[PDB]
Design a protein around this ligand. Structure first.
Ligand SMILES: O=C(Nc1cn2nc(Sc3nnc4ccccn34)ccc2n1)C1CC1
Ligand SMILES: [Cl-]
Length: 288
């Protein structure tokens, strides 16, 4: 790639994941939101219930139930195809930071970024590559705990705006979040998740501005290969921007591990005291 600029076994195994039919009330009248592979509804077990369009559904549930971490969205269970997830009071992280009625500080936003890094450190330790890390795909609960979501049976295209169709393969991909090598090969790794995490940090510090306005296709590759990266946000401290630049290192192997990112971001986080309010950039308001 160009990196220089130019079944009894499965049935017994799924017992601890399955929820009984009469121990789950799905409120189909109350719609939370729409995805490409299923609609999400309110439910009582209080939870979020995604109704999808069989062995793979059961298998995917077992793998997902094993992932347990405070910064990763847990699976409460499955039902037969219903995916029972914990309800996130404050919705997705992007809409939360964009909301004009919220008054985040620099500390708050770096804190959210640290939480995501902890979630990804856990997932990477399980050899799980996310492939679509972005603020829209993380969620926020009633204690403002950030949960990396949009994986396993919860995987979807929740905002169709930010997925572009590759002209040869037809795969709808989040090109603005993708590593330079993934744009060229459509292969994903933990090191490409790190690139995406860098873009997510940029989203946090811009309070949810779209990365690279008007560069929406795989021609982002040409743009990047001119020798470009996302600019430093006005309220992004210098050390955090240095971290973003490390996340976007041309060589995948030279990018920091999520372990390293948790370390570095924890240090930067600890220097702030909640005195710097982050305001939205006038040139990004209403921009898609
Ligand atoms: O909408 C609200 N709460 C809410 C919505 N969901 N949606 C899901 S489904 C799902 N899984 N991963 C993602 C990633 C991004 C979007 C959806 N995702 C799971 C829990 C949940 N809680 C509150 C009213 C603001
Ligand atoms: Cl602050």
């Amino acid at each position: 790639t160009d990196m220089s600029p130019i079944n009894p076994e499965l049935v017994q195994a799924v017992q601890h994941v399955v929820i009984g039919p009469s121990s789950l009330i799905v409120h189909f009248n109350e719609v939370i939101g729409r995805g490409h592979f299923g609609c999400v509804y309110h439910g009582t077990l209080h939870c979020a219930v995604k109704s999808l369009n069989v062995s793979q559904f059961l298998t995917e549930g077992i793998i997902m139930k094993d992932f347990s971490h405070p910064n990763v969205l847990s699976l409460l269970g499955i039902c037969l195809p219903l995916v029972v997830l914990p309800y996130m009071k404050h919705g997705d992280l992007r809409n939360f930071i964009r909301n004009e009625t919220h008054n985040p500080t620099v500390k708050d936003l770096i804190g959210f970024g640290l939480q995501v890094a902890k979630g990804m450190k856990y997932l990477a330790s399980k050899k799980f590559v996310h492939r679509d890390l972005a603020a829209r795909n993380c969620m926020l609960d009633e204690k403002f705990t950030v949960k990396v979501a949009d994986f396993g049976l919860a995987r979807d295209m929740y905002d169709k705006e930010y997925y572009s169709v590759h002209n040869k393969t037809g795969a709808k991909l989040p090109v603005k979040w993708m590593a330079l090598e993934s744009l060229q090969t459509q292969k994903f790794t933990t090191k490409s998740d790190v690139w995406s995490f860098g873009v997510l940090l940029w989203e946090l510090m811009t309070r949810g501005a779209p990365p690279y306005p008007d560069v929406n296709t795989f021609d982002i590759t040409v743009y990047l290969l001119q020798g470009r990266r996302l600019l430093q946000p006005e309220y992004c401290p210098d050390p955090l921007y240095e971290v973003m630049l490390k996340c976007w290192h041309p060589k995948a192997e030279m990018r920091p591990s999520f372990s390293e990112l948790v370390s570095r971001i924890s240090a930067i986080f600890s220097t702030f005291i909640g005195e710097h309010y982050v305001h939205v950039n006038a040139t990004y308001v209403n921009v898609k």
